[PDB]
Amino acid sequence: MRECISIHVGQAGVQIGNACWELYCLEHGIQPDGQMPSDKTIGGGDDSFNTFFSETGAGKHVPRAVFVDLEPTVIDEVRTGTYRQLFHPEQLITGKEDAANNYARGHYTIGKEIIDLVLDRIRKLADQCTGLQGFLVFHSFGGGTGSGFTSLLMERLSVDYGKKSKLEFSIYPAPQVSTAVVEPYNSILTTHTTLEHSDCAFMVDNEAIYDICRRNLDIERPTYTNLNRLISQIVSSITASLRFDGALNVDLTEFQTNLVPYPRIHFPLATYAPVISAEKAYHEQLSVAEITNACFEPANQMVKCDPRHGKYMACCLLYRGDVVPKDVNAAIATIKTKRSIQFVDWCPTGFKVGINYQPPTVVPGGDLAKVQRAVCMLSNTTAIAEAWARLDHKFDLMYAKRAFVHWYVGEGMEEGEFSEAREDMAALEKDYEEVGVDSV
C-alpha cells in the first residue's frame, strides 16, 4: 500500500536519481546488492520503506523506479557501476540517439519511438503495487529529453493512470553549468505542456545549488556530483515522511493540502539547513533554533528569488533527527517576532510542522557534515514567480528574432506552439500576481 514510483528522465534526472537511491540505501541499511539484514520479512512487507522498495523472495530490495534516457551513456554507468545489482535490467531503459537539446525531438521525433516501451515498464512496476499513491518524476527543464520526453510521458501518464498524483523535481537552468543556448525555449515548452498534468513541482535552480556549494561548502567549482549530493538531501527530506514512520511524522500529502491553493499554483519553494562542511561542523552543534532561522535566509533557498518581497500562502517545516516540538515551537516564536513573513489575507498564518526522528545520513566521500538534525522548509510564496520571469525574458529576447526556432520547426513543431506556451507562462505570472492581491 501507498507505493510511490520514481521516474528519472534524461541525464539530470538519472544522475540525480543515482544520488537519491544511493542515499536511500544508506538511510535504510540496504547494501549495494539490495540485501537488508534488518528486514526480517523476506520477499515482501508493508513497512514504511516498502513505499519505495519492493522485495524479491531472495531478499533483494529493489527501487520502485524507472530510469529513461534517449542515449545510453549515462544509464550505462548505472548498469555497470556500484549499485548495478540494485536494479533489474528492465528498469533501465535507453535509446541510441538523444534529443540534441531540442524539446521537439524529446517529445516527438525521438521520444515517440520509445514511449510505449517506457509505459510498459512503468505498468510492470504499477502491477506490483497494492495501493499505488503516485509518481515522482525527476528531469531537467533544459535538456531535450528532460523537457520534451518528460512532457510526453506526463501527458501519457494522465491518460493511463488518470488523476493519480504526479509530483516533479525539476532542474531549472543556470549559466554556470548549462549546455545549450536554447534551454529557455525548452523550459517554457515543457512547463506549459506539463502544467495541467502535474499536481506539485519542486523546482531546483542549479544556480542556487551552485552558489550554496561554493559559499557553504567552500567548493571552488562545483561539479554535478557536488550539486547532486546536496539535491538528494533535499529530496530525501521531502520523501522521508513516505519512507519512515513515527508519531510526529506528517505525510507529504498532508503538507500538499496546505501548499496548493489552486491547481496551477503548485510550485513550492524549498529551503534546506544546515549545509556545512565537516571542518566547520566539528565541535559546533547547530540547534533547532539555528537551523530554523537559516530557513528564512534566502541564500539557503533551492530557487533564487526574494520571499521578503512577496507574500506567503503557506509555510511548512519538515524536521529530521534530534528534534522535539518544544524546541521547534520556541524557534518559530522567535522567528515570528523578527522576520519578513507576510501572508496573503485569505490564508491562515500558522506554520505546519512535521518531525521525522531518523537522523540525516551522508554519503562517503561527500562534502556535507554528518549532522544530528536538519530541516527542509517548503513554502508557497509569490516570490517563486521571479524564476518564471527570468526565464520568460530570455525566451522573449530570442523568440523576437526567432533565433534557433528553425531547429524546432524542422522537427515538426509550429510557431503556434511557442506563442501558446509563452502566453500560458504570461498567464501563470499573472496568476501569481493576482493571488497576492488583498481581498476586497
Partner: protein, 426 residues
C-alpha cells in the same frame, strides 16, 4: 437493558474513543481481556448499556471502530485495551480521506459505509431495547467529519426513532493540522444541525489552553488533550452508566436539554483541573465554582457572553447532597441573569457515588448556552476568509462537489448563529 451503540470514526475519533473505553472500563472493573474484577455491584447494574456479555462472563464494548486508513486502528488494536474490542467491529479502508470532507462523505467514505452499517445492524439486532447511538469524531478532518456525518444520515434513515448523540471535536487554527479544517467543519455542522439530538462541542483550543494555562503542561500533546476529553466523556455519561433518576437515558436527557431542535450543541466542563497540592482535599463549594468557571469549559466560549437555556451538573464521589443542593442553588441565585428566565428550574443536578479513578470527588458540567454561537462565528469567519477567494476549493470540486454546496453550508451556519442570538435577547 437500554443499550447504546458506540461508533468512533477517523484518527481523532478513534484515539479519543480508545481512551474513553480505557477510562470507563476501569470504572466498571473490566480488565483489558474483558473479565470483570470489580468489588461493587454498582459497577455491573447498568454495565449492559455500554457492554455486551460474551461467553465466560466476558464483557465486550458495543463499539464499532471506523477509518478510511488502517494506521490509527492498528495502534488501537496494539494499545492498552485494544484486545477488548470485538475484532469484527474494526471496519477500515486503505486509501485514507486526505483531510477532505468530500472524500469522507461522497467518494472514499461512500465505498466503505455499507460495511459499517452491516456491523451497526448486527449490534442493534441483539439489543433488547436500543436507546440510540453515540459517535466520537473530529469535524476538521475527512473521515470523522465527512464519513462520520454520512454515517449519521444513513443511521437516521434506518433508525429514525432512535437518539443520535455525538462528541464532536471542533478545529482551531491554534491546534491545527491543515488549512481546510474550517471547510470540513462548516460542511459537518450543517449535517449535525439536522441529524443529531445532542452534540457535545469540544474545541481543541480550549483543551490546549487548559493544559497549558491551568495544568501547566509546557508542551501539550494530542495525548494530553485526549485524556481531558476522556475524563469529560466519562463524567457526562455517568448518568447513563450508573443507577440514577436524572437524565438516565438519551431521550430523557434530550427532552431536558433541548428546548428547540436545532439548538442542541452543548459546552461540557470538568473539575477538578489540577496541576502536578494535587493531594489536597476538594470541597463541594470548590467543585461547584470550578465546574462553572469558564476556564474549566471546553468550547472556548465565554458563558458570560450569553445565557444558559438549560444546564445539567453531575457530581461524583461521597459528599453531602445537602451541600451539593445548597451550592448549586447558590450559583443560580447569585448569577441568575445568565440563566434565561423563561425556562423555570432549568438547572438539573445529579449525584453519583462512584468517583473517577484516583479522585475522592469530581464534577461534570453540561451547558446549553447561547454563547456557543461564538464557536460557530469563529468557524464561519475562517470559512469566509478562504471561500471569498475560493482558496483550496479544488480539493473538493475534484471529488465532484460544486461551489453552491459551500454557499449553502455557509448560509446554514450563519442561520444557526442568528437563531442563538434571538434567544440570547429573548
Amino acid at each position: 437493558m437500554r443499550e447504546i451503540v458506540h461508533i468512533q470514526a477517523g484518527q481523532c475519533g478513534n484515539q479519543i474513543g480508545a481512551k474513553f473505553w480505557e477510562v470507563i472500563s476501569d470504572e466498571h472493573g473490566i480488565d483489558p481481556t474483558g473479565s470483570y474484577h470489580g468489588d461493587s455491584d454498582l459497577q455491573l447494574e447498568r454495565i449492559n448499556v455500554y457492554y455486551n456479555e460474551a461467553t465466560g462472563n466476558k464483557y465486550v464494548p458495543r463499539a464499532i471502530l471506523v477509518d478510511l486508513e488502517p494506521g490509527t486502528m492498528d495502534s488501537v488494536r496494539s494499545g492498552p485495551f485494544g484486545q477488548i474490542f470485538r475484532p469484527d467491529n474494526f471496519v477500515f479502508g486503505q486509501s485514507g480521506a486526505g483531510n477532505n470532507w468530500a472524500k469522507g462523505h461522497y467518494t472514499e467514505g461512500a465505498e466503505l459505509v455499507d460495511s459499517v452499517l452491516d456491523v451497526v445492524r448486527k449490534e442493534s439486532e441483539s439489543c433488547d431495547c436500543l436507546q440510540g447511538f453515540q459517535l466520537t469524531h473530529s469535524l476538521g478532518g475527512g473521515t470523522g467529519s465527512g464519513m462520520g456525518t454520512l454515517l449519521i444520515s444513513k443511521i437516521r434513515e434506518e433508525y429514525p426513532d432512535r437518539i443520535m448523540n455525538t462528541f464532536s471535536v471542533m478545529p482551531s487554527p491554534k491546534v491545527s493540522d491543515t488549512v481546510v479544517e474550517p471547510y470540513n467543519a462548516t460542511l459537518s455542522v450543517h449535517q449535525l444541525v439536522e441529524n443529531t439530538d445532542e452534540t457535545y462541542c469540544i474545541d481543541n483550543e480550549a483543551l490546549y489552553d487548559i493544559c497549558f494555562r491551568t495544568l501547566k503542561l509546557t508542551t501539550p500533546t494530542y495525548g494530553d488533550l485526549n485524556h481531558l476529553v476522556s475524563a469529560t466523556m466519562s463524567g457526562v455519561t455517568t448518568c447513563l452508566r450508573f443507577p440514577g433518576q436524572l437524565n438516565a437515558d438519551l431521550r430523557k436527557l434530550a427532552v431536558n436539554m433541548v428546548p428547540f431542535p436545532r439548538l442542541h450543541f452543548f459546552m461540557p466542563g470538568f473539575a477538578p483541573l489540577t496541576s502536578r497540592q494535587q493531594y489536597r482535599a476538594l470541597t463541594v463549594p470548590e467543585l461547584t465554582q470550578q465546574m462553572f468557571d469558564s476556564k474549566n469549559m471546553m468550547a472556548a466560549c465565554d458563558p458570560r457572553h450569553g445565557r444558559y437555556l438549560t444546564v445539567a451538573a453531575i457530581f461524583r464521589g461521597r459528599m453531602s447532597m445537602k451541600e451539593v443542593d445548597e451550592q448549586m442553588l447558590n450559583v443560580q441565585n447569585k448569577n441568575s441573569s445568565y440563566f434565561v428566565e423563561w425556562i423555570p428550574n432549568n438547572v438539573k443536578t445529579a449525584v453519583c457515588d462512584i468517583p473517577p479513578r484516583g479522585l475522592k470527588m469530581s464534577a461534570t458540567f453540561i451547558g446549553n448556552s447561547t454563547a456557543i454561537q461564538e464557536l460557530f462565528k469563529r468557524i464561519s469567519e475562517q470559512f469566509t476568509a478562504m471561500f471569498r477567494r475560493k482558496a483550496f476549493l479544488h480539493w473538493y470540486t475534484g471529488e465532484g462537489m460544486d461551489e453552491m454546496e459551500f454557499t449553502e453550508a455557509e448560509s446554514n451556519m450563519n442561520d444557526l448563529v442568528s437563531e442563538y442570538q434571538q434567544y440570547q435577547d429573548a
